[PDB]
CSV table of C-alpha atoms and ligand atoms in Angstrom, one decimal:
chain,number,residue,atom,x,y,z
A,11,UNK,CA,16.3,22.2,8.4
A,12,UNK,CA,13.7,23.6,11.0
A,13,UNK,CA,10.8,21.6,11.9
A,14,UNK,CA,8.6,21.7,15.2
A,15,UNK,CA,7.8,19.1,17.1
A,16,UNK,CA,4.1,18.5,18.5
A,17,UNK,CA,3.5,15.9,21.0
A,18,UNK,CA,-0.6,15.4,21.3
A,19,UNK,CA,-1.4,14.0,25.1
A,20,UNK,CA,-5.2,13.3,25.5
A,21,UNK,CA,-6.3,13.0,28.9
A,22,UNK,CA,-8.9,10.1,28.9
A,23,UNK,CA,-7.6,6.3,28.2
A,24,UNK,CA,-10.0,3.4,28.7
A,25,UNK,CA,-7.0,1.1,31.1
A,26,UNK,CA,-4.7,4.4,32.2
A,27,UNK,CA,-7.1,6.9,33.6
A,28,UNK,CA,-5.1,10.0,33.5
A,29,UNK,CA,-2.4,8.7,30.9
A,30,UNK,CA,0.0,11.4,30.4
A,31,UNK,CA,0.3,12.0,34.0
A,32,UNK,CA,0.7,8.8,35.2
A,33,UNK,CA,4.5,8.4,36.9
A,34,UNK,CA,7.8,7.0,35.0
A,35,UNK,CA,10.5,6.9,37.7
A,36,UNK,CA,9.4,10.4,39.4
A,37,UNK,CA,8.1,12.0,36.2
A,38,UNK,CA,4.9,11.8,34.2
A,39,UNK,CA,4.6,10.3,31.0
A,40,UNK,CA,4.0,13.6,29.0
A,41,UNK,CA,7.4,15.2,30.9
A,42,UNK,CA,9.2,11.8,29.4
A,43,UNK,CA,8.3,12.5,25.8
A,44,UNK,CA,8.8,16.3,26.3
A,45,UNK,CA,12.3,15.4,27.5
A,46,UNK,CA,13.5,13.0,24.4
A,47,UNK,CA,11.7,15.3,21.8
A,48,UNK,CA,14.0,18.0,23.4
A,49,UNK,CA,16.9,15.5,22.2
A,50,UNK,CA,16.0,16.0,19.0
A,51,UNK,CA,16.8,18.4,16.8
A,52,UNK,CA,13.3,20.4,17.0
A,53,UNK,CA,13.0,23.9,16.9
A,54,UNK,CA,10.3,24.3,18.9
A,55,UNK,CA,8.8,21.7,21.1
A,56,UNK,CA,4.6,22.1,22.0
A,57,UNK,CA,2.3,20.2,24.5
A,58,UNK,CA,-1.4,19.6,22.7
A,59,UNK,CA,-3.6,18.5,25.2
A,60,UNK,CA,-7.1,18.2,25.6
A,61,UNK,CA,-7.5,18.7,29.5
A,62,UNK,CA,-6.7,21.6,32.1
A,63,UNK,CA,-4.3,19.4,34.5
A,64,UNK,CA,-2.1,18.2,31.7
A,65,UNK,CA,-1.6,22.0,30.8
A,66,UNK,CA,-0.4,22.7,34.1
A,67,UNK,CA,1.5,19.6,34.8
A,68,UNK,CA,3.7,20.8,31.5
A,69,UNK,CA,3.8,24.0,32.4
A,70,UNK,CA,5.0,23.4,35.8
A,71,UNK,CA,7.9,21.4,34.6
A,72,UNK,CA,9.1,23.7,31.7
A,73,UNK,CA,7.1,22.7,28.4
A,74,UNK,CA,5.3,24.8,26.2
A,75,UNK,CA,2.1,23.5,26.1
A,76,UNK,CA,-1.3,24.6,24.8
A,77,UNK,CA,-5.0,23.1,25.1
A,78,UNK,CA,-7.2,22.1,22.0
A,79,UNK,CA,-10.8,20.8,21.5
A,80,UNK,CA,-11.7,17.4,23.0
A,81,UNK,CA,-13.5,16.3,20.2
A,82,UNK,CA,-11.0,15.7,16.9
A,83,UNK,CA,-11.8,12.8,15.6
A,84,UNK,CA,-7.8,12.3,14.3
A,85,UNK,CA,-4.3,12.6,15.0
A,86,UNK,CA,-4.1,14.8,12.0
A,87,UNK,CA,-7.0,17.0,12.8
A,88,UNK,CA,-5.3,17.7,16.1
A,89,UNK,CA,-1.9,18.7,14.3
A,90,UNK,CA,-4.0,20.9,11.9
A,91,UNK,CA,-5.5,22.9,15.0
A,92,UNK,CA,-1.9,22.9,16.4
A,93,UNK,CA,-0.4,24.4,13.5
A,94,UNK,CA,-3.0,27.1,12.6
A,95,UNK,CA,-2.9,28.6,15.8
A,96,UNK,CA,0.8,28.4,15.8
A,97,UNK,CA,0.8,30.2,12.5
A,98,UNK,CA,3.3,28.0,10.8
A,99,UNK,CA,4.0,28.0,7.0
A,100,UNK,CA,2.5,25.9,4.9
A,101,UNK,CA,5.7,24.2,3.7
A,102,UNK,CA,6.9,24.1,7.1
A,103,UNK,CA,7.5,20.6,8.7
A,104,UNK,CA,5.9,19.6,11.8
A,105,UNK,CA,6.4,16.4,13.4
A,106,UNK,CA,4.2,14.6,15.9
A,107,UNK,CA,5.4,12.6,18.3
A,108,UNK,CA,2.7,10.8,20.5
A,109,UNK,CA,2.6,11.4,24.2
A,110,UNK,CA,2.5,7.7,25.1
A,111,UNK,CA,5.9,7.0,23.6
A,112,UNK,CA,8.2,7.9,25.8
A,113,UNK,CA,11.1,6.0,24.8
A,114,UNK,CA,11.0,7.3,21.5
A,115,UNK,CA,14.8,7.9,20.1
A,116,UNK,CA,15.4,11.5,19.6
A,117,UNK,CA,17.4,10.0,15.7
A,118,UNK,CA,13.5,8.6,14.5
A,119,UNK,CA,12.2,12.6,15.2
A,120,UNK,CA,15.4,13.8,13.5
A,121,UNK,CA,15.2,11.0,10.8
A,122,UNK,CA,11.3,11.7,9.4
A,123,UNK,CA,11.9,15.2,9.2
A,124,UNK,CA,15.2,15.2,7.4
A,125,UNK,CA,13.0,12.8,4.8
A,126,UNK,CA,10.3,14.7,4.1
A,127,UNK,CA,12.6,17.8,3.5
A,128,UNK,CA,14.5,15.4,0.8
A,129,UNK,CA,11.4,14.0,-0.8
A,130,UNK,CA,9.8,17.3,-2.0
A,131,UNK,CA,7.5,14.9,-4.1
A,132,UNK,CA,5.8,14.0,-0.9
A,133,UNK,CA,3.6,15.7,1.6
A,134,UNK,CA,4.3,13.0,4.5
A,135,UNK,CA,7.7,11.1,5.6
A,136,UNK,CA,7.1,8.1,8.2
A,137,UNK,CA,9.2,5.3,9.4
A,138,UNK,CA,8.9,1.6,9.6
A,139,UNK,CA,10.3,-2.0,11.2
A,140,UNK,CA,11.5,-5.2,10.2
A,141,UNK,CA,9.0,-7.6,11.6
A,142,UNK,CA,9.9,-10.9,12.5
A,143,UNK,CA,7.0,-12.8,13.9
A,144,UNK,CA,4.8,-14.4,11.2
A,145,UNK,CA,2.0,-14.1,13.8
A,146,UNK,CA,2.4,-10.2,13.7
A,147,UNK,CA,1.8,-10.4,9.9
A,148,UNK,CA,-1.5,-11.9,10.5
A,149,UNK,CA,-2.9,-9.7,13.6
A,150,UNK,CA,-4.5,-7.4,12.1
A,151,UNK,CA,-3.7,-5.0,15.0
A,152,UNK,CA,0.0,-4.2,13.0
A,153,UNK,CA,-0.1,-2.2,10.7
A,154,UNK,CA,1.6,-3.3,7.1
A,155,UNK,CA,3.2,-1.0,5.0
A,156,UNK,CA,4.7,-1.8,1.2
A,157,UNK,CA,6.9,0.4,-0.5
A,158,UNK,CA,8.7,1.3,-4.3
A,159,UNK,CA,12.6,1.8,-5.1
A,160,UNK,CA,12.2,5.0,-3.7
A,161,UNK,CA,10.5,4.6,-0.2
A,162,UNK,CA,7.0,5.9,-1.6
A,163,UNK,CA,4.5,3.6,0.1
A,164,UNK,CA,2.3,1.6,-1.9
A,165,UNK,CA,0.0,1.3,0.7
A,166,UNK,CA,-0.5,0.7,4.3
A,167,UNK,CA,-2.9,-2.4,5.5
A,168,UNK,CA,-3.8,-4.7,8.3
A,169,UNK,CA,-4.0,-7.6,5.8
A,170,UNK,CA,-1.0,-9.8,5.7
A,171,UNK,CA,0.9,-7.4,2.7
A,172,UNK,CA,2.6,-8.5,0.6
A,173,UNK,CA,1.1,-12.0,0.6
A,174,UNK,CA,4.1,-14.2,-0.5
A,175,UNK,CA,2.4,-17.0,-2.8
A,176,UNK,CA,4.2,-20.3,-2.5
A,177,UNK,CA,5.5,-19.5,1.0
A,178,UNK,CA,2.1,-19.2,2.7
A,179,UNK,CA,1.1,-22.0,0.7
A,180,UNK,CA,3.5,-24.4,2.0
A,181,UNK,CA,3.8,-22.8,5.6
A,182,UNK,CA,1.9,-20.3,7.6
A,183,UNK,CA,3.4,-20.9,10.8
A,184,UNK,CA,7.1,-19.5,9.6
A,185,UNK,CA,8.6,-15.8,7.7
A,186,UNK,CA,9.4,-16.6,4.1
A,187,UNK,CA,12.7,-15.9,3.6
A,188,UNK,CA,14.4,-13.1,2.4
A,189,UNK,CA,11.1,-11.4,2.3
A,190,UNK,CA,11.3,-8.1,4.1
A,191,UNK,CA,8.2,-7.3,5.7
A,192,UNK,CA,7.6,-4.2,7.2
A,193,UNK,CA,5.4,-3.0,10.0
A,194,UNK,CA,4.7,0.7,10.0
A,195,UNK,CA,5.9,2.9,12.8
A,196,UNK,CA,3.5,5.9,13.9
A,197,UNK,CA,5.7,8.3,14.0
A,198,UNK,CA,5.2,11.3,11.0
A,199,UNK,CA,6.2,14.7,9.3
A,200,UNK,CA,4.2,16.4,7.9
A,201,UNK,CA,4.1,19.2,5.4
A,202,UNK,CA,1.8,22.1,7.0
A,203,UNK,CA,0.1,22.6,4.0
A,204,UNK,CA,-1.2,19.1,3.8
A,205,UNK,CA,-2.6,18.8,7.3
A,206,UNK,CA,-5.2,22.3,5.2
A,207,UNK,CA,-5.6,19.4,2.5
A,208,UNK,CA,-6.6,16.8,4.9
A,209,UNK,CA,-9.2,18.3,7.0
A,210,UNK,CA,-10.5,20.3,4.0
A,211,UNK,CA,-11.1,16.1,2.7
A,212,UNK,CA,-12.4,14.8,5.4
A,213,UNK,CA,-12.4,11.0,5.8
A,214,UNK,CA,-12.9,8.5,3.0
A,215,UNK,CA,-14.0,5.0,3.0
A,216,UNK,CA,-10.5,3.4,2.4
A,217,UNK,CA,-9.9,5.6,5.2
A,218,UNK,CA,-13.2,4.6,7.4
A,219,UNK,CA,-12.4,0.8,6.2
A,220,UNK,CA,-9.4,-0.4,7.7
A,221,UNK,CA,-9.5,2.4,10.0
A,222,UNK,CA,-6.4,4.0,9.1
A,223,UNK,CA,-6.1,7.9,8.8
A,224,UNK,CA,-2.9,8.0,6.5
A,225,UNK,CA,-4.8,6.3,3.7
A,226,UNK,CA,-6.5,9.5,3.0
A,227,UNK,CA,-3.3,11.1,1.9
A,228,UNK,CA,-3.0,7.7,-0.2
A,229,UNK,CA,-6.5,7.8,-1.9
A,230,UNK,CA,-6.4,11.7,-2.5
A,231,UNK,CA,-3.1,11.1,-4.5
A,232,UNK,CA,-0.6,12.7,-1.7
A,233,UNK,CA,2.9,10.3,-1.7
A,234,UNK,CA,3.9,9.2,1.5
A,235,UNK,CA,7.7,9.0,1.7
A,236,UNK,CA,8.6,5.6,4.0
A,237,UNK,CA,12.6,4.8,5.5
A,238,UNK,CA,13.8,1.8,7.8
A,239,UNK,CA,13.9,3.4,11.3
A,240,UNK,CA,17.3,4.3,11.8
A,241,UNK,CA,17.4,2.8,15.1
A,242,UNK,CA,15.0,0.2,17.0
A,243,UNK,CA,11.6,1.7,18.6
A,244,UNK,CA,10.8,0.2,21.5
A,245,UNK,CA,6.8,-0.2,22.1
A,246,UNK,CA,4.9,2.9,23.6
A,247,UNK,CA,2.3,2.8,26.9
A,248,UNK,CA,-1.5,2.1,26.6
A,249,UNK,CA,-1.5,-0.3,30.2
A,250,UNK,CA,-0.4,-0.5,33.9
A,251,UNK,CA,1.8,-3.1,32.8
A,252,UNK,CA,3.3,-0.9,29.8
A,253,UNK,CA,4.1,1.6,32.5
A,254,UNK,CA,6.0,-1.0,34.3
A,255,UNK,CA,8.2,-1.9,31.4
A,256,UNK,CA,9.3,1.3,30.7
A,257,UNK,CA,9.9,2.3,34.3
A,258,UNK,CA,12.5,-1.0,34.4
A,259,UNK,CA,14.4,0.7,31.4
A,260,UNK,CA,14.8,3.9,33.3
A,261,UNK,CA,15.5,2.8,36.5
A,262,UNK,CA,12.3,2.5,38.3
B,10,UNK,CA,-9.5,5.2,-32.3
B,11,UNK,CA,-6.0,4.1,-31.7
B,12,UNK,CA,-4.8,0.7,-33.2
B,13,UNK,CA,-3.1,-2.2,-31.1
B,14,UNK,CA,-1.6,-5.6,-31.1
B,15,UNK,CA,-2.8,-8.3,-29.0
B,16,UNK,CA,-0.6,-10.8,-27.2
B,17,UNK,CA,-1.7,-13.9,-25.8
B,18,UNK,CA,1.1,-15.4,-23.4
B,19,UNK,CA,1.1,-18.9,-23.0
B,20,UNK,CA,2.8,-21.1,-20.0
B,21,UNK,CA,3.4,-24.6,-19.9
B,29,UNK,CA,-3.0,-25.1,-17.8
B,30,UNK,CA,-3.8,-23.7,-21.7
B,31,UNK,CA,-4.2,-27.1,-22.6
B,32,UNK,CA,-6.9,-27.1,-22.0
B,33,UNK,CA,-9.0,-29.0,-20.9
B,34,UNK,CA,-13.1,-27.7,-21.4
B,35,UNK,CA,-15.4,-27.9,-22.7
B,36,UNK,CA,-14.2,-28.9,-26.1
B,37,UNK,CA,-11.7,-26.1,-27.1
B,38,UNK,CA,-8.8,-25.0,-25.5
B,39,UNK,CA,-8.6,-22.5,-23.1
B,40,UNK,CA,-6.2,-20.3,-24.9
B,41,UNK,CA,-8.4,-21.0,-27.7
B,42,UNK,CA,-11.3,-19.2,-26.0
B,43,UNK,CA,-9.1,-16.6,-25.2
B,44,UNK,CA,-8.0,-16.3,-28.8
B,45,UNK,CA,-11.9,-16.8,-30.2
B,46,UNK,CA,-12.4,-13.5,-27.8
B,47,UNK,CA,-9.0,-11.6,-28.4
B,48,UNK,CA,-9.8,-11.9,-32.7
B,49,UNK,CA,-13.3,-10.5,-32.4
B,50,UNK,CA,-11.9,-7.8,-30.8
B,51,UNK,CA,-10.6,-4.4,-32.7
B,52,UNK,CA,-7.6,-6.1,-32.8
B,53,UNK,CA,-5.4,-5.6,-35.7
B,54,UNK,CA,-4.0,-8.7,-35.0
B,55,UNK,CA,-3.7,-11.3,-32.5
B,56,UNK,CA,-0.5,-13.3,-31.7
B,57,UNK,CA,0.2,-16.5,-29.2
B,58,UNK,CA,3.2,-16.3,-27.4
B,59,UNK,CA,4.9,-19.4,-25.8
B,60,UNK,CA,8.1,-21.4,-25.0
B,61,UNK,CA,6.5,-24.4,-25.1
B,62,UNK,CA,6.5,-26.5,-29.2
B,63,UNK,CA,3.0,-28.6,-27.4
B,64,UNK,CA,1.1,-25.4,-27.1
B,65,UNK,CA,2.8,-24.1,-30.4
B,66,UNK,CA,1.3,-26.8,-32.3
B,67,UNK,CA,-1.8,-26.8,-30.6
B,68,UNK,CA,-2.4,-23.0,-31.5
B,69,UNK,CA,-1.7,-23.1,-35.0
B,70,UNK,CA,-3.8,-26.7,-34.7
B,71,UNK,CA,-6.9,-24.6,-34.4
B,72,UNK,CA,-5.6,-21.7,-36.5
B,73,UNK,CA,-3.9,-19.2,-34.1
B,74,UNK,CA,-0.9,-17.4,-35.3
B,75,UNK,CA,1.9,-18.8,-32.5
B,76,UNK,CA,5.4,-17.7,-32.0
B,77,UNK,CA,7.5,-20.0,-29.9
B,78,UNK,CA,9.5,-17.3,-27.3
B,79,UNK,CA,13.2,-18.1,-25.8
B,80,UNK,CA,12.3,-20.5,-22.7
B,81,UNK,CA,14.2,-18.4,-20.2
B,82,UNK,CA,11.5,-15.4,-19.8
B,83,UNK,CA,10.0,-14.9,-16.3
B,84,UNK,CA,7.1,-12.9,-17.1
B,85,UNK,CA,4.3,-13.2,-19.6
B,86,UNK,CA,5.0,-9.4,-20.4
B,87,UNK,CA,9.1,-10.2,-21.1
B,88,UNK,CA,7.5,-13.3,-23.1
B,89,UNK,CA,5.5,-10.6,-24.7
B,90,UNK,CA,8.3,-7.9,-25.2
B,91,UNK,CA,10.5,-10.8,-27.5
B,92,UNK,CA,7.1,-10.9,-29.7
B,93,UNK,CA,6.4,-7.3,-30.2
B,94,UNK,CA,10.0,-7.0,-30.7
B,95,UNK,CA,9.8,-10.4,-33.5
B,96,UNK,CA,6.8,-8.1,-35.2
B,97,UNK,CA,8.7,-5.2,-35.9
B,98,UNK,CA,6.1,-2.7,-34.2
B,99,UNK,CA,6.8,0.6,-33.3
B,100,UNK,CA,7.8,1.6,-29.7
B,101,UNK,CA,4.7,4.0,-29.4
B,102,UNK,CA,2.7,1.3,-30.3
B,103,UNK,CA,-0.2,-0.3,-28.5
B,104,UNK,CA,-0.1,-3.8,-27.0
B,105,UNK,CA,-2.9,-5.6,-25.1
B,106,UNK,CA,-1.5,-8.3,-23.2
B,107,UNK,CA,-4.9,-10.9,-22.7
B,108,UNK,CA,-3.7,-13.0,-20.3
B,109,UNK,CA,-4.3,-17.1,-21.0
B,110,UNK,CA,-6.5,-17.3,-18.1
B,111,UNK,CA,-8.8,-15.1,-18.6
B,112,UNK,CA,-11.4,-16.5,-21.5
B,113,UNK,CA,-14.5,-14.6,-20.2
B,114,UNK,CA,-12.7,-11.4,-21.6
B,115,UNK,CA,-15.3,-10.1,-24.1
B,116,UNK,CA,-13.7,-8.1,-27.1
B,117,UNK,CA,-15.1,-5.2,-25.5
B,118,UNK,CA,-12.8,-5.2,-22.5
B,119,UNK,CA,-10.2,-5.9,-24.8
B,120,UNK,CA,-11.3,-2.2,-26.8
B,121,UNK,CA,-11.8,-0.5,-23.5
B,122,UNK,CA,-8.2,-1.1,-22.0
B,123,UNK,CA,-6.9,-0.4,-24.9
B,124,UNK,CA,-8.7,3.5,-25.5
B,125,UNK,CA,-8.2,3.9,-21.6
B,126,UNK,CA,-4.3,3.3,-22.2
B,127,UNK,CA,-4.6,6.5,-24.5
B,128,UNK,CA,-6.5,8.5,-22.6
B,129,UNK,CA,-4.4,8.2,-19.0
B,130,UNK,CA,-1.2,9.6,-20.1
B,131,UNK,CA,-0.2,10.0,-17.0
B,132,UNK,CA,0.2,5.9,-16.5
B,133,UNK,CA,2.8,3.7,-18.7
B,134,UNK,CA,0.0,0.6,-18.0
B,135,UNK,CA,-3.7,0.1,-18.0
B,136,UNK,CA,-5.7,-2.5,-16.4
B,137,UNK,CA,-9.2,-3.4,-15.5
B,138,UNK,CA,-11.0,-4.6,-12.6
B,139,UNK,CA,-14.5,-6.1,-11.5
B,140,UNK,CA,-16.3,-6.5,-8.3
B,141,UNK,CA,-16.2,-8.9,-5.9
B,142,UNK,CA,-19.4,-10.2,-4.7
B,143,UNK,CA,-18.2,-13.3,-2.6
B,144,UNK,CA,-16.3,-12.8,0.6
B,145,UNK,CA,-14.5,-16.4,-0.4
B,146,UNK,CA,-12.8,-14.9,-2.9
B,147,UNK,CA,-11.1,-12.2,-1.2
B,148,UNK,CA,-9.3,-15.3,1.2
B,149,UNK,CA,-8.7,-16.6,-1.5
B,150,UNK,CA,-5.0,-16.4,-3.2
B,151,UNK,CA,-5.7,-17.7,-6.4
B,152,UNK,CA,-8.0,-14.3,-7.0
B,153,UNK,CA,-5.8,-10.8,-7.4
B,154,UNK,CA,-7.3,-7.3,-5.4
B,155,UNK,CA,-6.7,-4.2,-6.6
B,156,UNK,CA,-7.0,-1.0,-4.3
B,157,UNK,CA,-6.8,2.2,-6.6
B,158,UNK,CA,-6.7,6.1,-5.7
B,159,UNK,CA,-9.6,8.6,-6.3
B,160,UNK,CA,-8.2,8.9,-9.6
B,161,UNK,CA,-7.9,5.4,-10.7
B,162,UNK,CA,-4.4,4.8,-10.0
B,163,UNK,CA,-3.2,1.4,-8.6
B,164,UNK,CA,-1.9,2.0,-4.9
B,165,UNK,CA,-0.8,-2.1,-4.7
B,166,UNK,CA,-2.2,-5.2,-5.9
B,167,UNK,CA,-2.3,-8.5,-4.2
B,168,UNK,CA,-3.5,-12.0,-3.6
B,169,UNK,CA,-4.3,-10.7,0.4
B,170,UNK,CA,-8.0,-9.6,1.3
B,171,UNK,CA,-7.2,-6.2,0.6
B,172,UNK,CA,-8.3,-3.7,2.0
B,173,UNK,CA,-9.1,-4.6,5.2
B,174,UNK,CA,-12.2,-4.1,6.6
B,175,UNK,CA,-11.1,-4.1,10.4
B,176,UNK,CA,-14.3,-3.9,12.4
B,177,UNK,CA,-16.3,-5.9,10.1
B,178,UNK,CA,-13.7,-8.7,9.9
B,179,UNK,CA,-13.3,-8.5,13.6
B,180,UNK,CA,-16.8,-9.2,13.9
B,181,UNK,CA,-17.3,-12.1,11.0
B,182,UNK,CA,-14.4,-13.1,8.6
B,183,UNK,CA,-17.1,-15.1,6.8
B,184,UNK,CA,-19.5,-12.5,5.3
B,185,UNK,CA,-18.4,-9.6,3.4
B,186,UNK,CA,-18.4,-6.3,4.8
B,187,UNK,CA,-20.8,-3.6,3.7
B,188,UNK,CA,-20.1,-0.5,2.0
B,189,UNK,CA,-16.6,-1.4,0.7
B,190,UNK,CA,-16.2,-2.0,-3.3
B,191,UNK,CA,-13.8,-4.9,-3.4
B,192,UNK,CA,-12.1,-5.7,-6.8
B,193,UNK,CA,-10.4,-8.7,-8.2
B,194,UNK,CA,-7.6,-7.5,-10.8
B,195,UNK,CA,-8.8,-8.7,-14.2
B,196,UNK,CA,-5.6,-9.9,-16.6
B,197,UNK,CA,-5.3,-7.5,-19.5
B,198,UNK,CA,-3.1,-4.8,-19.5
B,199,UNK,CA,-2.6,-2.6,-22.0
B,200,UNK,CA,1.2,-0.6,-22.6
B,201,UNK,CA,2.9,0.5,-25.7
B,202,UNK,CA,6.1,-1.5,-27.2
B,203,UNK,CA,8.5,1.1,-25.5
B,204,UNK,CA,7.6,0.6,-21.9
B,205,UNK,CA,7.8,-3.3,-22.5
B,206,UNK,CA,11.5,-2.6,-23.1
B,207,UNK,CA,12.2,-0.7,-20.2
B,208,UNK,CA,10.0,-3.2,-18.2
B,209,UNK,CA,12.0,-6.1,-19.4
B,210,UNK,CA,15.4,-4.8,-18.6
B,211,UNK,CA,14.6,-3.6,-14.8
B,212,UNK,CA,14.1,-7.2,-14.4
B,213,UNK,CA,12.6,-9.2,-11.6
B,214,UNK,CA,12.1,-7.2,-8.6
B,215,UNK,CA,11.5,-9.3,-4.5
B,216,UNK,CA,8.0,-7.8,-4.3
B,217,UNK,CA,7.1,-9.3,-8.0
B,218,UNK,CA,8.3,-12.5,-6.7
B,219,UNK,CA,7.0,-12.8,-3.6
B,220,UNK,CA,2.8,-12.3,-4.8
B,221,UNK,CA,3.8,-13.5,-8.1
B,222,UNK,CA,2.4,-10.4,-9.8
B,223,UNK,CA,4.4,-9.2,-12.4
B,224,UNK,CA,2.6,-6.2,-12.7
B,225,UNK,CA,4.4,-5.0,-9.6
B,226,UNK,CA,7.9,-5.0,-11.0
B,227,UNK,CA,6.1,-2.0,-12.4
B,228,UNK,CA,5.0,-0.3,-9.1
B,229,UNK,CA,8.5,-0.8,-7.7
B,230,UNK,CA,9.9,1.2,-10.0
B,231,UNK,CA,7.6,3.6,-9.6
B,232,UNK,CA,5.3,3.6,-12.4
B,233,UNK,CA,1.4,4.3,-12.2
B,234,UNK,CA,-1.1,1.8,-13.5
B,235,UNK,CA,-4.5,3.0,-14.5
B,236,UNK,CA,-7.5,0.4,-13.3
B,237,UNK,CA,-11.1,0.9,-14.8
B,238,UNK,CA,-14.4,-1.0,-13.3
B,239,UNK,CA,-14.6,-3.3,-16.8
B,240,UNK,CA,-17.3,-1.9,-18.8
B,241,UNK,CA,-19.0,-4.7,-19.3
B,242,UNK,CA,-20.0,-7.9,-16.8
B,243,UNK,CA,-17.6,-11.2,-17.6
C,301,LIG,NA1,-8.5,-27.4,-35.7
């Protein structure tokens, strides 16, 4: 099954000025992800990026890489510009795969886009993670997801979800057993076709409310198919000290 | 225009304790003025038996082992003899502000959503208590009135607003707590029963997600009336 793989890297981050650019063990962030979505088995691989030096830092190292507008106020809107100007079918797949995860597995790319080509009753596949801290269920800055039998998410939510009754009841300081609780893990395909839906939408306020783009797909009616990541996914970079992390795991 | 079958299931709470009747008998008083063609109290316990058909309820005493109001249910609208395309309206024991209206309304909107094997109804929620609250059931639905989950969580989240103050309730989001009533036909309560209990059903204690794990859709209204 083809799909193409776009890795958004926006210049401007509050605590890494410069983000994509910033140096894992002799080579940017952005040349990082290129190199494990290249792993993967993409058929095309393409640099969105929303400044001038990111463009030529991914040229100068091999990538295709094209610039978009500054403004989109979305993940998805940038994938929509991406794919238009690409020319891709609508029921082409096109992943994204963020440009501050550079140790992203090259099986979670594979993974989402082998879903969504078996789940023709959805427009999206994504991926989630056991969680295992209780204290993760309640920050509200992880992002809980619920399926069905199938792997069709109920919903996505920063509330604790599901809430188990008698459990939280008891004790709030431990997991309920045997309760599988999943956090949701950023990483999606997409059916061309839907990312025309989407900004054709525009946001809603389930959406706008717990600040969450994929539930406009979910309030519009769309499915969203959802698998166990086939492998674990280690956390991507936002800080100096996220850089550090990942520069100990590859040698730096 | 369609005709259903209410059934009241009963849990050994119903008894009573306010203000002089029964709370299952408030339910009932609501459940017989509705368009009912009849109205039926189901239970495994012989105390609330007797203490339905003490103020007049028709009562059937269910098999003990049932681990759902609606399997509770099912054994009754199989004891009845109604047809599977038939209509039941599952009033829930705890719910006596149900006017007979409601009752009607889930009933008609049953019919009219095809495309869902259950339908439910909902109200707002006005107090940001409630939504921390456990004891009170949130709905989130689609555009079109489908259930996306339902659960005892404050759900959905409103992230800045509850960043800001978890003690008021944000603006501009319509909350709603799950009202009890559901609405199905005699077939589906079959194929409900035998999927059995499902981890997610167990975990919120919400039956009526054994339903979305098995990949049904539920049909939520705004109830037509105030409680
Ligand atoms: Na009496």
């Amino acid at each position: 099954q083809a799909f193409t793989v776009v890795i958004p890297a926006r210049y401007a981050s509050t605590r890494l000025p410069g983000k994509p650019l910033q140096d894992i063990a002799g080579q940017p962030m952005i040349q990082r992800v290129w190199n494990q979505a290249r792993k993967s088995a993409a058929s095309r691989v393409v640099v969105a990026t929303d400044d001038e030096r990111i463009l030529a830092a991914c040229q100068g190292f091999g990538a295709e890489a094209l610039l978009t507008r500054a403004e989109h106020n979305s993940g998805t809107d940038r994938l929509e510009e991406v794919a238009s100007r690409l020319g891709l079918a609508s029921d082409a797949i096109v992943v994204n795969v963020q440009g501050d995860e550079p140790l992203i597995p090259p099986a979670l790319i594979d993974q989402v886009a082998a879903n969504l080509a078996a789940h023709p009753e959805a427009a999206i596949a994504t991926l989630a993670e056991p969680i295992h801290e209780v204290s993760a269920l309640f920050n509200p800055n992880v992002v809980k997801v619920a399926t069905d039998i199938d792997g069709l998410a109920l919903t996505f939510s920063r509330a604790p979800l599901p809430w188990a009754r008698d459990a939280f009841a008891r004790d709030r300081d431990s997991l309920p057993e045997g309760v599988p609780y999943r956090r949701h893990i950023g990483i999606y395909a997409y059916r061309v076709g839907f990312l025309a839906d989407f900004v054709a939408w525009g946001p809603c306020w389930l959406e706008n409310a717990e600040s969450l783009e994929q539930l406009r797909a979910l309030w519009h009616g769309v499915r969203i198919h959802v698998a166990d990541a086939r492998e674990n996914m280690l956390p991507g970079v936002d800080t100096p000290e996220d850089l550090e992390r990942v520069r100990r795991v590859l040698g730096g």
